[PDB]
Amino acid sequence: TASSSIPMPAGVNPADLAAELAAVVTESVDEDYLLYECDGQWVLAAGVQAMVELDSDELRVIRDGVTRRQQWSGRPGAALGEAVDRLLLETDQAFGWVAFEFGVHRYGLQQRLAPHTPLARVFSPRTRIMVSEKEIRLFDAGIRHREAIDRLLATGVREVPQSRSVDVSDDPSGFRRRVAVAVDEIAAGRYHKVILSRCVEVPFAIDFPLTYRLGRRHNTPVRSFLLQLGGIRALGYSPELVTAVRADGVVITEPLAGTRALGRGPAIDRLARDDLESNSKEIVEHAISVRSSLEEITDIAEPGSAAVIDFMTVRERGSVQHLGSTIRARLDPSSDRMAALEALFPAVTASGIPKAAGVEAIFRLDECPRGLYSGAVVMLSADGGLDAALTLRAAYQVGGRTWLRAGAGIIEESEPEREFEETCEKLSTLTPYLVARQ
Ligand SMILES: O=C(O)c1cccc(-c2ccc(C(=O)O)o2)c1
């Protein structure tokens, strides 16, 4: 099905070649794109053939300057799903992002959103370039894209420049104070856990593809992305899989809970791993989160199909390590891939426990709308597939402002100073790897 298949050159890693190709194609064609890494394939979705924009109050489908603009009601997953299924009648895959705000409708909180709040942006690409350890496959590539790959193979990948440091120690948004307020709300019995966050400004412009390459070779995320889409530049090393739906009907979700530092050498990392695996506080939070995922997944699964296939094992994520479980079910004939995403979104590590009360608290105690942060980056296929990675450990550039964003799960025993240090550990997935724009 690919019109070209080129063997991967010796000594070149696919993440490096795919991100370099995104830079070369940017220079020659100047188009929007989304690069998504999923199970050893880096798929560069290049150019926008058609775009679906789901907002809180409207749905727009834009193709070649022509817009279908429609009011929508009911579930946001049905509005997005109907438009995306339409894109996939004539193309194999669609890609994009879903905001954290897409998940508030299931809890009846959508009236709290401001008008015109973005919920999702999903596009069908003009071209797809798939890069694996074995080969480069070209789908619907015109002469400029074919010549860009030829030029890159002739020159080889660029050497990544040295990175530039950033200060994460300032607290202009009062994260420590906001954690103290959440702790008091938890002590009052309003909820059990809430995830709060803070932004850190990057006071210099970064090169997104070079920063992506440098951070990727020091991280082991479950998925990753690099994009330039409708005025947003973003990259991330997604630590958690929100949902994967396969064409054969198998649904997977991989919740994480608990955090210890990682990357401090073998001896310190082993002590942190043994503490994480045996700490009552982390075990209880992980068990509650697995029980929550199983309750959610039963609403969309064939009866008796839900199962935990890997339980409470350490998942290494670069600057941090977490407890994780892999939950599997079979999609019920009465359900669909968007209803599976809606059942599992937002993740507990994006919201809290109970999830409804965590989302309500975020509207008051966090900077809203969150947008891409704690939402998902997605890949959908014409055969029914869906892959949705949780957007944490990401960097953004919008309108000349570059920033990072990290948070923490706050419970009754949380201390503001420790939670602030925890956001610093999560920021460390990116802060040593920022390449300035040259
Ligand atoms: O609540 C937990 O146990 C838990 C576990 C792993 C991650 C997170 C979490 C919340 C926000 C971020 C981030 O901005 O990266 O990460 C929370």
Numbering used by the authors: 13 to 450
Authors' description from the paper:
MbtI from Mycobacterium tuberculosis (Mtb) is a Mg2+-dependent salicylate synthase, belonging to the chorismate-utilizing enzyme (CUE) family. MbtI converts chorismate to salicylate via a two-step mechanism, with the release of pyruvate. As a fundamental player in iron acquisition, MbtI promotes the survival and pathogenicity of Mtb in the infected host. MbtI is known to exist in two possible conformations, generally referred to as “open” and “closed”, depending on the position of two flexible loops relative to the active site, as extensively analyzed in our previous work.
In the context of our efforts to elucidate the binding mode of 5-phenylfuran-2-carboxylic acids to MbtI, we obtained co-crystals with 5-(3-carboxyphenyl)furan-2-carboxylic acid (II). Despite its modest inhibitory activity in vitro (IC50: 35.2 ± 2.6 μM; residual activity at 100 μM: 27.2% ± 4.5), the compound was chosen as part of a large panel of crystallization trials. In the case of MbtI-II, loop stabilization may have contributed to improve the overall resolution of the crystallographic data (up to 1.6 Å), leading to a significantly higher value than the one obtained for the MbtI-I dataset. Moreover, the electron density map for the active site region was clearly interpretable in all its parts, effectively providing a complete picture of the active site region around the ligand. In agreement with this hypothesis, the analysis of the ligand pose revealed the presence of an H-bond between the carboxylic group at position 3 of the phenyl and the main chain amide of Gly270. The binding mode of the compound was equivalent in the two MbtI protomers. The carboxylic moiety of the furan established H-bonds with the side chains of Tyr385, Arg405, and with the main chain amide of Gly419. The furan oxygen interacted with the guanidine group of Arg405. Finally, the carboxylic substituent on the phenyl ring formed H-bonds with Gly270 (as previously mentioned) and two ordered water molecules; one of them established a further interaction with the hydroxyl group of Thr271, while the other did so with the amine of Lys205. In our previous work, we speculated that the superior activity of I could be due to its ability to strongly bind this amino acid through its cyano group. This hypothesis is consistent with the present structure, which suggests a weaker interaction between compound II and MbtI Lys205, as evinced by the presence of an H-bond interaction between the ligand carboxylic group and the lysine ε-amino group, but a higher C-N distance (~3.20 Å) than that observed in the MbtI-I complex (2.29–2.82 Å over the four chains of the ASU).
